[model samples]
Target chain A: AMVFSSKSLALQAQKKILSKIASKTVANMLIDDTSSEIFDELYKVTKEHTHNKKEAHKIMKDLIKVAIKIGILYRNNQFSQEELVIVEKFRKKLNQTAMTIVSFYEVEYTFDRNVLSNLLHECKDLVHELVQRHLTPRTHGRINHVFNHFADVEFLSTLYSLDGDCRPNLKRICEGINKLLDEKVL
Target chain B: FSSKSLALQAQKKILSKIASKTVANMLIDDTSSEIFDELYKVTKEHTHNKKEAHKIMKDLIKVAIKIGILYRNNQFSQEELVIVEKFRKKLNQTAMTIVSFYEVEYTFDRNVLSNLLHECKDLVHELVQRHLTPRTHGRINHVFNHFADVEFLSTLYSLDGDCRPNLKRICEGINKLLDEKVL
Candidate 1:
């Protein structure tokens, strides 16, 4: 029964949303709100009401709903070149703040791996299909693009799983891609 | 004529060394050696200068080595053959000699290095095409896992000196393949 301060709780909520948004970006999925309206609300609530757990949790719940919406949008392909550019720009803005949020949360809470397990599996399935369809040097260029997109997903997933503290370990990913190229499958 | 005679003598010694070291056994028929000997005689008689004779000798050694290595590994993929031929032509155009810069002080024979680089390219090309199998994916994945820490493709491309984006694309493919372990 360690106590979590309201400011810390607010910061935690903010980090979680930022990290997931970045994950979606890396996964090549749509992000519905580049402005992160829910996250800002949570920040304000936590800042003004340091002792209001109920209010903080409510804001956290709203952020989760937005996260799910963006995730579903990613899966549905319902989301643009400029829109993507805007989302990417937003991701960059969040990147440094995300790093700080990650470090801060790491001390107060353990990472939740279940956050993207289903997403990882879905991406893995995509990789399998890509491999089966294009197993020759003739399809090398196209398959290479799909393969790299998913590598980013895996790298970010691993990064998030480790309390978003350490950089992604892409050595295994790099070696795997090299072996495929060496094998002439790409 | 003195330089021509000296060049012929040097060529003879080189041919003997080549024969003793693998080329003799690789020649399929006695006529091949006889043909080379006859060519050597004609080459010496028709040489314009020592340099001309020396160049002919180097060409002979290069061809012999290519034939020997290619004959040894006869079975290969069509794509590999295509790619290797493309690379070979490019290497030739660039006049890329594999000899170290300090060859003046050491016994750096360009013939052996040239032959080996071509052989390696062929061998590697074949290996790439051959290993691109679903069954071999696990083993291949492990091999790539070893290179994960090294930024292997970037390093190799940096050393390659080709600034073309296409080369970088190929490097990206290699990197993607390494990351794609399950498939």
Candidate 2:
């Protein structure tokens, strides 16, 4: 015998409504070009839901730039013991924003192409600065490694604008830089 | 004239140019909104009211602390004081030049501005220790030696927050800093 669960049916309907709201929020961000405030709001929601660890993991899909910026700040050791709390708070907010928007949507909305392009340029500039200013053997080795992978990674980033699956390439570049920070080579 | 005073003149010119570029970069290229906002407001306030320059620097010290970029806790070591004195002497000399060039009426007080720039010495120390690699640190030291010199000059140039003259000189000075490879 087949049975219908009213609870399951209601939950599914709730998800559909949430998904529409998330897509509309993302669409509004593109139209306004003023996402910093919204980004802050979304980040706040993530903080309020700290009980759910999955929320933190899930939110990063939409906040690539915030993640990368925070990583660089941490790697540089820019935060004090007290200030770290604030940084952590900001990071949680960024994650929350991403999770809220991405959780419901069947279609994955990606980073704005202009913002991605600007970040790619910034990455290239940072690498150049590291190369020109940092001359230790370790840095030289890392720079060479980055150079070898630069073209491939950049190609992937270019492809990301067309398809969200290529987002991993953009992520790899950020991770590579973070690795250099960990190695203390840059 | 003694070579000491002539040497002082040369130092003043170089320091003025360095100050110009540092202030320009702080205004334009700083990635942190917290740092830039504090700097912008203090600079604007100081330009409009000369009496506010000391408070402007105090605010900067507070901002640096908030940012976790402050090295010293509102105190200078003897060694740092000596360096601070050197910056003061060069800046005082440069202030004379500005007075002569602009034909402004009032006499400039070296100590008022000197104390203001001295407060920023710790910021230079923080930047070197945290942001820069060891290899490039020494090369940047000369430029940062007069870090507060930029704030004072920007105040004078902006004259109630009008920064066109200040910005033009900064652009020219940046080219020189780049050409000299001191940045």
Candidate 3:
């Protein structure tokens, strides 16, 4: 057995200090407060954080909300103009609906539905609905506008997947990528 | 509950906007049109290349004749059809040469390349049926041999100057060969 001494005590206490330091290092990662810049620093950390069940569902729910807003906007005339009208109307409808929802929470009065529809109809010339005319060669102008809005490669890949490797008329290029992700393993 | 209903409503709205092309116009203006652009380009390039190659081969045959390696053209009884057939085969051989010149040594799928080969064979068959015969086969062979590359020679003539459209189709055919079967 080794004799107990001040140096040994100090050396043994050093590891305890190191262990505490290491433990705090892990604790600091999760037990963050207002001074926590680490989460911000690691904001886009690559490891897929799919474990958060509630957050995943929330993102999906939010997307569905946006889609619903778009659907309301698409209720107007789908003819005699380009397809961008639908997207613009969707944006307006979303804003109107959001405002109504906010007003409801604050117990405020609502606007007339017909008045809203009339306003949408008046701006019909500026808005286009080319999405409705996807098959026609002329629809390309509108398709290109919507295409520019998305930055997600996966979303674009999904769009391209609707057409094949060569839709000579459509001119979409990223067909194979969506198929790769469809299998999910890729 | 409201959220679910909203999603459903949105989907309905989007579906409603989808429309079809309207046949609004009646008059056929009958505007002047060029050749199908793709086939035209292909045929033009192929023709230019073929004519240039043919001239070189003619010169080459003259040299061969001077060296006593080539037979006299006057000796042939049936020349036109026979000579054209020979050039057709030489064109195939020349296409193979062009293939090599491009260094396109991509490891093609045998199945896809085989399909492409068959398509080209059909084109060649049409060429021979329209322009070549057994009577002139010998002269055609003699003339085609001078260039040493039959595939390109055959294809250029086979293309028949429908440059733009044919080139596009040919490219698609080649791509299909690789995409569908080849690596």
Candidate 4:
């Protein structure tokens, strides 16, 4: 509606990202590319952009504000591509494992939070198994790295669902995102 | 895929660097830090017009006081971490003191205007220093209130000052202690 609203909205977006994420540095990493584009465009939010002097002042004040919220969104320690691949595969496996549990229980579509969390952690007995396996120190360190992020959650919620429709898969609208990722050119 | 991406995203990034304390970090929670972080990044680094420039000085002193109050509070410490949340709120109230400067209007003596503003600048200047030391609260009591517009206040920022490092000192000290908390 009003130009005033964007600044408030940007602050809201930044707060939402911060609630779940660890720090601004991590927020910077999670934010999408458009966030970066808008931030870069921060410089162009100047006097001439609005033409009116007072409005330009308010615009820059508001515009300067919106840009920072944009940047505060999420970057990295610079992992190598191979290491990054390992990390990705590590995550993929976690999700695949999660998907398995969700499917086995037949939650239809709308699942809740803690149940989702417990799934990621189901095999977390990895630490004890960590020693007996003859994996190299590098591999062990990588596992530690993978397990580290599990530390940041709000709470496990003192850790759902039922009924006849549970059997139906209740399929309405779903399962489109990933397969799309793979079929880009095909 | 969302889970995988977020998991990987979270798993990535070693906080190998300790987050430094600035006026921003010291005064506000990380929620606000993300936006305040952007405020500093653009304002100090970018150009501005006279009208917009008024707010720019607000940003600078807004930040400086945030850090400055922590300076007055005897430096952020590990002991203060438990109380840091409460202490942080009180210190952050100083930020409003800057904006509140305009709301509470004032008159400046013509003879003392240059020297008065200079003193105000010198005061934060001392905040930037270790030997002479800056006054903790009441930064407005002596100087900043006397100026009509921060366009004058803005120029005074660097007088006798090696400005940024103290901001870093306070931040590094705090980060070393807490490693930054999520809750």
> Please, what are the lDDT tens digits per residue for candidate 3 over residues A126-162?
3334234423353334333322222233322332233
Candidate 4: give the clashing pairs.
A27-A73, A27-A74, A28-A73, A28-A74, A29-A74, A29-A75, B21-B171, B23-B67
Residue B48, candidate 1: Cα error in Å is 7.6
Q: Which has the higher DockQ value, candidate number 2 or candidate number 3?
A: 3
Higher-scoring candidate on TM-score, 1 or 4: 4
Give DockQ per model, in order. 0.00, 0.01, 0.03, 0.02
Q: Candidates sorted by DockQ, descending order?
A: 3, 4, 2, 1
Order the numbered candidates by TM-score, best leading: 4, 2, 3, 1
Worst 10 residues of 2 chain B by lDDT: B65-74
Give me the runs in candidate 3 sitting further than 4 Å from their true place: A1-82, A105-186, B1-183
Give one digit per residue, the lDDT tens place, for model 1 in A1-186: 742122232233334434544454445422212223323432343434335565444444333333333334334333334444544544443343333334433443543334333343444344333234223343334333322432343434444444433222222233333443455322
Model 3 chain A: which ten-residue window has the lowest total lDDT? A38-47
TM-score of each: 0.18, 0.21, 0.18, 0.22
B1-183: candidate 3 lDDT, tens digit per residue: 233343444343333222100000100111100111222233335556545443433332222222111111122224533653554454354344333322343432333333444444443343334334353333334333422234433443343543324434545443433344321
Q: Report iRMS (Å) of candidate 4.
A: 15.9
lDDT (10s digit) by residue, model 1, range B53-82: 434443444433443434333433457567
The number of the candidate with the highest lDDT is 2
Question: What residue runs in model 1 are displaced by over 4 Å at the alpha carbon?
Answer: A1-186, B1-41, B48-50, B57-183
For candidate 1, what is the total of clashing residue pairs?
14
